């Protein structure tokens with residue numbers, strides 16, 4: 001068990017540098033804020049775990065479940081530089097800083113080495129209509145219209161029936177895709193998956 | 206490099222690697238990929 005870094009804290013307090021909160025942002029800038037300003041703890045919606053738990057309730061992301069459906073993009077919550085009541089210590093004391101941040105070269109070999117040496121990385125890819133419908137297997141865009149960019153966490157790789165892939169975690173809850181995860185084609189910068197990878201080293205060491 | 210890798214196995218001592226979040230109705234995926242990978246790395250490099 002270890003520190004769960006607060007999506008809320010970064011999303012709400014980064015600002016201009018990172019983009020426009022709930023309406024888009026820059027991951028490279030996000031990693032950079034972590035190095036400069038650091039980030040506090042904070043769990044999932046209504047969990048009361050951490051300094052700043054996520055404040056936007058979960059929903060059904062293009063799947064059927066019991067949760068209310070997702071309704072596009074709402075209001076970026078404000079930046080509250082204080083922890084939830086019932087949590088200690090303070091927000092300043094609760095910050096975790098990154099030592100550095102850096103892009104990872106557009107080589108599947110270089111992305112693979114990075115993950116292997118240092119852990120999971122963040123990357124971005126282009127979501128097409130046919131991606132929404134993903135349940136399992138290895139995703140490979142065929143049909144659909146370009147929908148927009150999507151930032152994710154790449155945590156591994158492998159081969160499923162001759163098809164190489166990246167093991168990727170989405171943030172659309174557990175009832176989407178393969179328990180919230182998905183595999184997407186590896187080695188061809190498919191949908192630009194290898195082209196926008198960013199990572200960094202914890203200040204702790 | 207091995208033909209396969211899954212950080213959930215290489216580092217079972219880090220629960221966050223297996224953890225999936227929900228961004229909700231907000232285009233914050235840019236911040237989600239970041240804090241998730243940062244939670245992982247903090248554990249991998251220390252606690």
Ligand SMILES: *[C@H](C(=O)N[C@H](C(=O)N1CCC[C@H]1C(=O)O)[C@@H](C)CC)[C@@H](O)C(=O)OCC
Pocket residue numbers: 023024025026027061062070072073124127147148149150151172228229230231232233234235
């Ligand atoms: C990140 C982002 O969140 N993108 C969107 C998304 O995944 N959404 C919107 C909120 C609900 C969820 C959905 O179920 O659709 C959407 C545009 C993906 C197709 C994105 O805005 C960003 O900042 O990425 C640039 C790196």
